[PDB]
């Protein structure tokens, strides 16, 4: 039933809405995140592993957003490690 491709896009898009709201004083942060996502292997972006990662990150972002940049860093790090280049 689960389509990880669409689920990951949903989870990532939900996370970015939080980021947009809470990083408005540093406008370069959000495009950087999109850039990291843009450059990752699309199969990784559609993977169950990425889904699991996004679930944890978004969960932490929702319950404890005082460490948002921590979470942002995790996500950027993971995405860099799966860069298509």
């Amino acid at each position: 039933k689960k389509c990880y491709k669409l689920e990951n896009e949903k989870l990532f898009e939900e996370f970015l809405e939080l980021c947009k709201m809470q990083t408005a004083d540093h406008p370069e942060v959000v495009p950087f995140l999109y850039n990291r996502q843009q450059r990752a292997h699309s199969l990784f972006l559609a993977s169950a592993e990425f889904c699991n990662i996004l679930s944890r990150v978004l969960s932490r972002a929702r319950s404890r957003p005082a460490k948002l940049y921590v979470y942002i860093n995790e996500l950027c790090t993971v995405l860099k490690a799966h860069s298509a280049k």
Binding site: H26, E28, V29, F32, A66, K67, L68, Y69, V70, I72, N73, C76
Partner: peptide, 17 residues
Amino acid sequence: SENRIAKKMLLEEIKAN
């Protein structure tokens, strides 16, 4: 704070990139 340093580190990486 952990978040402060995380923020500082991310911003520097962006500026460097």
